[PDB]
Design a protein around this ligand. Structure first.
Ligand SMILES: O=C(O)[C@@H](O)[C@@H](O)[C@H](O)[C@H](O)CO
Ligand SMILES: O=C(O)[C@@H](O)[C@@H](O)[C@H](O)[C@H](O)CO
Ligand SMILES: [Cl-]
Ligand SMILES: [Cl-]
Ligand SMILES: [Cl-]
Ligand SMILES: [Cl-]
Ligand SMILES: [Mg+2]
Ligand SMILES: [Mg+2]
Ligand SMILES: [Mg+2]
Ligand SMILES: [Mg+2]
Lengths: 403, 403, 403, 403
């Protein structure tokens, strides 16, 4: 019986915004969870502290599932990114506690080690094809086994994933949304050239990825998928907005390029049709935005029935706390595919001291009891919240579109 | 060009919590929109004032659809109760402003009057059948053409819809969520007697409704539906949790009792399969919780291709701002089914003076420019926020369940 | 790192045959897992000691999921009752060891407590209706919340569930399989009277079950299901052989009597269509015959996406080791339906001392570290293996049929 | 009335393990059946001798079908490789007896001769493409009309089907499973080159096969299928693990390369969806592992309705007894496709003297009464069981995978 005596939502910006729940049990055992929802951070803060937290006090922290259900069902209005991100943080924290009590790293509870480390991909980008490739060469020298390639679009001032940042990508860069302009035709005409060149310079053993980032229609993705088959990509991610899951039928019907989707998914329902109809090969949903370890685990199992692997989203806006948690999950399942790994700042790392390590293209969560992560509150207090928005995207005619 | 110069979020609790958005244009033309999310109110307040509101400043209030898209797509993490309720408030207020600029009630902009008024249902409930029927008799004498009936379950301390309230039902009643105990079997064995007796006393002209409130499995709903066929109910609402929309296939397959669902839906995607497969007869989604007049209008047109009518939710946690917007939408569509009408408190009515009127079993939005509703800010300020939660539900063995 | 130093298979027959696997770790921490396959026991014994066991030596007992996969995939010939029962024993014993290492009951590792106990059903049976009802009355007085009812068929020497046993049923009763004679028509014409009378005497609060035990065609099950609707059965189990899972479509299409199936299933693939098409309401698959806690947990999460609950089989040929593992799993899931509970003999209980307890219609696994169960090897050795077979069934014309 | 007076399970290892049932009738007529289940041999031994055999004694051997049903249904737990391999051996033996009594080879009972002999394929392999091709040239000179091609994968230490053995392949080569490492990307990049070269050297009249051996996902096989179309393969076998039969839809949708699957199948249910949806062109299931002559015959008939032919598995771990039986089946059906033929050792041939012969690319079962095979018990006793396991396979990251 592990009485919860305190729960606190902490907000800090050591290079970018992060929200963190910290839960303290009667005898001083603590657990932390990530609750960062990029571009909408303080909405999760309230949902937690004004609403969910008062129900945590006095409860038995052992009851992870019951607590999961109490909040998911109890809110009445169900699901959604704000609600499911709040719950992920409770869940992460509860598993962290569980691990400490058991005296085991969290993966030891979830099925134990299924591989020697978690293979990641990094983030090569450049304004030109040459730029991008040079970045990919760098990554390949650094021992990355998988690399994502993004490059500027001829005749467009900007496009997703290209900037001055090289080991990562931080698009929430302004106190109002940065405005972008877009042309599907110009992208579709040019981006295949990138992977053609990538194969010429980099060879065939390295895994290459691409994030389309919500900008195509199904018949368009189908075609990009087709143009990309000669270069044997690891996956083509978020090719089309997926609220209409049937949208992926057209793509699957026309290309064999492997498909990923789901960083934004809040619950299993966002991916069910996609999984059950075998329309994707990788699910990108994370413990952070789809309701924590408890839920992602149920989802991965459903996914394994349909040849679907995990390709968990790994952007900078997932704190080290999420990443510790993602690693314990990644380690413990059979159908793991890949883990995205964007480098945080050295200030972020200082605020969220963690046991996980990177070597030979792989992350490993380490073997500390629980998650193997904590939050330095004093250092945290040194960096207050600063408002920052994700960018937005319009068509050439001004049409409001998808960034 | 109608420049937005200010936009403020107002929180008041004249009998229960309500969140309101009030937008002001350069020329002093104002609009209001409801943003209430029962039991998770402050989270919407944050989502709006900390995140959405700053983007409103300086925009042209005329661009309703662009602003709608800007917010829906620009959030990146899409949909969900929080985001869509916040967007509803914006949408309602822009429509209000549109109305005023045009010197017309909103419904005149959306298609014109399609009926002489909007037929409502009221809520009769009680511990015993005779208590519930006694109440139904009152509502009929009051000229209601439709009545929802809820009654206690023999062998259970409490059930949905049953309490000391007669003209409404207000479960957001405690500083921590009230816990309840549920038995499906006891409920299924008893409720049909409710309606048998209802028909004996009230006869066959009055429409009789029932809200199952999330507590059945499809095969159980099938059976309850069948048991209730003899009494010709207008609808059987929320019989099963709808995240799995294919769930309704089994109900539809076994009973001709007409089906309602959707008060908690945040977007078209929560109902798409239900509508396209003709699994339901009434959609209960509202302008408040499904992204406003803009979104609900698209949804209604889609629903009409498949014999689905509107039966919008209208419990008291929808403020009179919602009700005004709901009544304009209701007036303006071919496929109107019915409108729920729970009496707000006198204090609430005073805080949100409105033009809409109730006569002869029907509401009417009235004919003022805009929505015909405002918030009295001085009066509002006399009624501070008071934290209050919806109740939760567990099975006899203690399993977390749905309320 | 928990090196496996020994792993031995133990065969004993304290009232009936049981096969047990006992794994020993370098530091003297041990675990047990049930490996009993009624009527084909020694085949599992061989599969384990001659083939699987040698691979266990020297492995890290922590790696539960890897060992699970090693054995499932490494056998080459996959699935099947033998292989999956043998793997179940391994899985149970590793979970037992995991529990002990962590100083926690297994259920604490799988999600924590979700209910205050695990509601069971007992078995009332008899030659005549009055004999069966007489027995149901006893079980109700004993505080059972659920009761299975089986009764003799007029015009048939014998039928399933009927015999001189009251608190259990043990058909593995002869050195060569007992032969029986079956008539579908006589059964279908009589059994509904069972439940009519059951309801008259026992009333409508108690859950009433029925195991058809494989003897119908879909169109026949459809009809029996319909005939039994008036009596509101908790479930109708194994109504038809399920190798053809589309068979349930016709039943589901014609009746709202809730359906159970699956005690004999060896893997997820035996139930996948049944679950995904919502053809059933309860899955009867067990940790013993479907590859253990590891597998059953994935299966349960899948079943929960489709309104399917667990109604695990629990006849006496599942040893108390199975029951301990079953109770930890049952305690830990949101979608628990019910647990079958057949009383083991006193001698059996003595051979497998256990922590689980029965009170007020509910079992509880208790709170010892691990599964909370052991085999007493000296006592076990006093009860040699005794060959015993399940009975077989033929039609009136002599056709080999299903028992 | 042919009373069975004795049934004996014989175990021997004349180069590799084989299990054999021998059944003796009252007047001295005997029949033999194969019961070898590679890597799990003694599990079938027990299932037979400890469990099934006692029910054979005293029965009428004429009753092949009733006996088939008695054991398949009678076991209660149904199907699975262990159970279905045991039953195959009973069935083979019973048909062998039947043929002797009738004084005819077994094919004469099953429909008689449908072709002049049974066309086979052999097994070319090599570390390099050159190696493999040279082996295929050899086979083509030896008069083989069909040849399977396997070759080493660049940058992998090992891969399926390559070894020092040339007229066959014996992978169960160790007293614990040999461990292998795997890379899908490296295989997919290189194996098409093999068949390109094969066509250049060998020409277009010879039939060429390839066994993928369980290592791809559907979208991957689809692609390999596509890359292989220019070389017009006879089939691409076991491209993906088939427990999810819907997995083959994606492949069929994208390639016209002919598909085979099923050596591991235990029953019709393992192939039904695959057959009924026309997802494969060849079924590889055998009399050995899918329940003997009786069952495979029913299956072939179902297969003929959907353009599916037999491509029976023929590895060394099917004894001459199985091969005699496979030939009588192959001879007697309209929809025969191909028979795999790996050479046994000369010691195996001595222990299982057989009447079947090989010439001009074809096997023929001969025209002796019954199967035309027996087992030399004295020679058999000269070679005791020796434990040997099939290999296993992990990904580069250590993930437990499919061999
Ligand atoms: O149909 C209804 O009126 C009910 O579902 C509502 O009272 C519901 O319980 C509340 O609006 C939830 O806030
Ligand atoms: O539901 C049940 O309890 C029955 O199906 C079992 O008694 C079954 O007959 C035996 O467990 C088979 O071993
Ligand atoms: Cl939300
Ligand atoms: Cl939301
Ligand atoms: Cl098996
Ligand atoms: Cl088996
Ligand atoms: Mg992305
Ligand atoms: Mg309702
Ligand atoms: Mg049963
Ligand atoms: Mg093969």
């Amino acid at each position: 019986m592990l009485k919860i005596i305190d729960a606190k939502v902490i907000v800090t910006c050591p290079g970018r915004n992060f929200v963190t729940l910290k839960i303290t049990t009667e005898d001083g055992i603590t657990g932390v969870g990530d609750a960062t929802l990029n571009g909408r951070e303080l909405s999760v803060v309230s949902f937690l502290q004004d609403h969910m937290v008062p129900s945590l006090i006095g409860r038995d922290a052992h009851q992870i599932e019951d607590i999961w259900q109490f909040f998911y069902r109890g809110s009445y209005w169900r699901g959604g990114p704000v609600a499911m991100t709040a719950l992920a943080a409770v869940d992460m924290a509860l598993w962290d506690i569980k691990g400490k009590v058991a005296g085991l790293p969290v993966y030891q509870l979830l099925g134990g080690a299924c591989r020697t480390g978690v293979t990641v991909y990094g983030h090569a980008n450049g304004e030109t094809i040459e730029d991008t490739i040079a970045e990919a060469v760098k990554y390949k020298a650094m021992g990355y086994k998988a690399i994502r390639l993004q490059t500027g679009v001829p005749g467009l001032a900007s496009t997703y994933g290209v900037s001055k940042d090289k080991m990562f990508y931080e698009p929430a860069d302004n106190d109002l949304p940065t405005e972008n302009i877009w042309s599907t035709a110009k992208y579709l005409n040019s981006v295949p050239k990138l992977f053609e060149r990538a194969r010429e310079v980099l060879g065939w053993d390295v895994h290459l990825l691409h994030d389309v980032h919500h900008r195509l229609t199904p018949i368009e993705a189908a075609r990009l998928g087709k143009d990309l088959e000669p270069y044997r990509l690891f996956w083509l991610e978020d090719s089309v907005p997926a609220e209409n899951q049937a949208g992926f039928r057209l793509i699957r019907q026309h290309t064999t390029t492997p498909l990923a989707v789901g960083e934004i998914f809040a619950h299993v329902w966002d991916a069910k049709q996609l999984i059950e109809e075998q329309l994707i090969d990788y699910l990108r949903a994370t413990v952070l935005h789809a309701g924590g370890i408890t839920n992602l685990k149920k989802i991965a199992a459903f996914a394994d029935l349909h040849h679907v692997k995990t390709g968990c989203h790994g952007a900078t806006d997932l704190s080290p706390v999420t990443m510790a948690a993602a690693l314990h999950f990644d380690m413990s399942i059979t159908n793991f595919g890949l883990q995205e790994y964007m480098r945080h700042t050295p200030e972020t790392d200082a605020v969220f001291p963690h046991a996980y390590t990177f070597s030979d293209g792989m992350l490993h969560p380490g073997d500390k009891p629980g998650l193997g992560v904590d939050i330095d509150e004093d250092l945290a207090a040194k960096h207050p919240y600063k408002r920052a928005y994700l960018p937005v995207n319009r068509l050439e005619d001004g049409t409001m579109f998808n960034w």
